[PDB]
Design a protein around this ligand. Sequence first.
Ligand SMILES: O=C(NCc1ccoc1)N1CCCC1
Ligand SMILES: O=C(NCc1ccoc1)N1CCCC1
Lengths: 193, 193
Amino acid sequence: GDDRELAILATAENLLEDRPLADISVDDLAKGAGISRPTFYFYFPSKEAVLLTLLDRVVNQADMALQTLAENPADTDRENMWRTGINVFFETFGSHKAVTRAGQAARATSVEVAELWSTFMQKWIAYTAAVIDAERDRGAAPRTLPAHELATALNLMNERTLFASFAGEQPSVPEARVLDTLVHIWVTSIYGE
Amino acid sequence: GDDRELAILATAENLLEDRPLADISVDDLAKGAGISRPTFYFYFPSKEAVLLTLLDRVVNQADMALQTLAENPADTDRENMWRTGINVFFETFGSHKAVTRAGQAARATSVEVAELWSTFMQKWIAYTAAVIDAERDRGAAPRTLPAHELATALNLMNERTLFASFAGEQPSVPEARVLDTLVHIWVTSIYGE
Ligand SMILES: O=C(NCc1ccoc1)N1CCCC1
Ligand SMILES: O=C(NCc1ccoc1)N1CCCC1
């Protein structure tokens, strides 16, 4: 039960490395998972629902990793603390590039994919703004822009720049340089007067 | 000749304020431009080509405005100089939100729209990096990140953040706050040690 479902998910993630969702059929997912077409429809209403679940799992993996960090501060300087946090997203989405690229494309068409992304982006921006606020309250960061507006632009920068790097878009920061590039802009814009 | 073409372009831009390209027909564009369907096909091969031309005009308007600025430096401080430059894009794309949103959606499907965007982004990043390099050569900015990598992330930040603000996405920086938000992050990341 959970086995056939996992099989369908694993097939979809494998097939998405090679072609987009449009070029993958329900019959394709069923065949890869070793089931018939009506059996597929018993676990998922559509191939698009399969992508939704894959993206949901990726998003929650990142969110849980970030929650772990939040409850277990690394013992290091401020620059390293922001790096560890951005690194959650570099590693989690960068470990699932095909789901990330397909999930990105699906935002234009799927209201469920758009709302899932939007919900978690609001959560990650709120967390970012809360940490900035904490840093200002402690006297470590200057009161410049509204924390929440700053947090919004920096998280949108990371969304676009990470996902261009993973897709090898032209232009993009090389994937081996993107973490350092992002950490620099976050630290200078959060702490710079 | 140029009149019927302009009429088709003006109709497409008006209709795109209300619905996406998918919900607009060649018959719709022809009717709005006061021509028949085969007459339309004489000026444009497809509705998608109409969007390509609209986006091409918007992109070149911005590029030309930025080239004007480049040849006519505003007499003001560094923070204001970057603001005037980002403002080219805030004003040009923000004056054409329907074309901007439709052009964005079309990158996923149209190789011509994807290549047009990519060509100009490479040009604007190269210009950004050249100005950063000039500022370092003069001793006004510190040698921190590779100028071109920094320029790439900052232009990708502006792409995503401006276009979220114009579309009223959730999350987004309000359009009345986005210019100041972006200028802050550019100046602190370019000049911050
Ligand atoms: O790197 C990111 N955010 C960094 C972050 C958020 C909270 O703490 C660090 N993102 C947000 C969405 C996709 C990439
Ligand atoms: O604001 C931007 N760039 C700012 C810029 C580029 C060159 O000088 C200022 N962009 C680049 C693409 C869409 C938005």
